[PDB]
Write a protein that binds this DNA or RNA. Structure first.
Ligand SMILES: Nc1nc2c(ncn2[C@H]2C[C@H](O)[C@@H](COP(=O)(O)OP(=O)(O)OP(=O)(O)O)O2)c(=O)[nH]1
Ligand SMILES: [Ca+2]
Ligand SMILES: [Ca+2]
Ligand SMILES: [Ca+2]
Length: 341
DNA sequence: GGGGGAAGGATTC
DNA sequence: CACGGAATCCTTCCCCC
């Protein structure tokens, strides 16, 4: 099977440039301001001219200002990036019908019935890249291989604005050279666990007894690594469906006062419903980020849909259940709706 | 012994 | 000093055949 993976370069920042080309060349950082003070918040992402100095997704906006005081700092405009993404995805949907939109800027295309041998795939790659650069003026990186995982790894090795192919032979070389940490799905928590098992390469997962790999990282992940090691990973590409909609917000100050948190929670609910489109959820979860960046949630499933009146009422009850079972102060509050009809 | 929810936590991207 | 949207997986409790 031949899988082509696409991943837009420094997406949010690159969109901000396209919309104001006068930004190209200068350091661009897209921020999410929490409003706890002037520049409280984090970096959603930044362009290469900024990333080369350490400014990247996840760090505090303040840290970023210490490093690049003169960089251009723009507030994150999610709705806009979302549309630019949709237009591109619609464009990809014309090079293949079997498409899986993994994230706001990732997509896997199954082009097995559109080509043969990696030569035409590469060409189909430059075709897509050129097309996207023409109609939306966005640069993307392409990855091509036998399955979704290897297609993604390929892209990573080819960024930025690149394209690469990992053939059935190149793959065999990766199973022994690739750090188990650079495999998708293996974050820091899992990378260290596999380290204590003497698993530094994908192939090394074949040495341990399955029963103790499972004991360390769970069955799912275990069978996952083993499959990629035996070159037996072959997950189908397919339309993924939104199964959850929600909204979280940060409060000016950490609180425990129910009447103090409510207005925030109610704002989360109001946006969540507008976002719901016209979907009827039967489950609702209240999510709170406590004072020490720890997450705690409480929810309920109903035998019928949830009107907005019911969401309001139940959310307050669920928040109360949280303050009563956790002594910590609340920093962030939000709601999540699921189990749509 | 075991299926399927539901709930709350844990990780990853 | 650190935001957010959402998917998947895990352990536990449960009701009960
Ligand atoms: N709000 C928020 N957005 C994030 C975060 N991490 C990534 N994103 C955004 C950044 C991009 O706009 C989009 C895709 O992220 P990627 O990991 O693919 O990196 P990016 O697109 O920045 O460029 P790259 O792949 O490194 O060339 O998702 C995050 O921590 N918070
Ligand atoms: Ca990207
Ligand atoms: Ca991406
Ligand atoms: Ca990693």
């Amino acid at each position: 099977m031949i899988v082509l993976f696409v991943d837009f370069d420094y997406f949010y920042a690159q969109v901000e440039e396209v919309l104001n080309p006068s930004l190209k060349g200068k350091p661009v950082v897209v921020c999410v301001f929490s409003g706890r003070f002037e520049d409280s918040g984090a970096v959603a992402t930044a362009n290469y001219e900024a990333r080369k100095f350490g400014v990247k997704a996840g760090i505090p906006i303040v840290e970023a200002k210490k490093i690049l005081p003169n960089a251009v700092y723009l507030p994150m405009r999610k709705e806009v990036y979302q549309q630019v993404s949709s237009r591109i995805m619609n464009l990809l949907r014309e090079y293949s019908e079997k498409i899986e939109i993994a994230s706001i800027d990732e997509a896997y295309l199954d082009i097995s019935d559109k080509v043969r041998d990696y030569r035409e795939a590469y060409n189909l790659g430059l075709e897509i890249k050129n097309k996207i650069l023409e109609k939306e003026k966005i640069t993307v990186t392409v990855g091509i291989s036998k399955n979704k995982v290897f297609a993604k790894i390929a892209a990573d090795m080819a960024k930025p604005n690149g394209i690469k192919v990992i053939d059935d032979e190149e793959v065999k070389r990766l199973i022994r050279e690739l750090d188990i940490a650079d495999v998708p799905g293996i974050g820091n928590i899992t990378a260290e666990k596999l380290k204590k098992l003497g698993i530094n390469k994908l192939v090394d997962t074949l040495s341990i007894e399955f029963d103790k790999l499972k004991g360390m990282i769970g069955e799912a992940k275990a069978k996952y690594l083993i499959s990629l090691a035996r070159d037996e990973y072959n997950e189908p590409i397919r339309t993924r469906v939104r199964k959850s909609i929600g909204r979280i917000v940060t409060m000016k100050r950490n609180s425990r006062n129910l009447e103090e948190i409510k207005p925030y929670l109610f704002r989360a609910i109001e946006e969540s419903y507008y976002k719901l489109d016209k979907r009827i959820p039967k489950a609702i979860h209240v999510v709170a980020v406590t004072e020490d960046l720890d997450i705690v949630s409480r929810g309920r499933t109903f035998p019928h849909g949830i009107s907005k009146e019911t969401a309001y009422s139940e959310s307050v009850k669920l928040l109360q259940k949280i303050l009563e079972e956790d002594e910590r102060k609340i920093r962030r509050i939000g709601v999540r709706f699921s189990k749509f009809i």
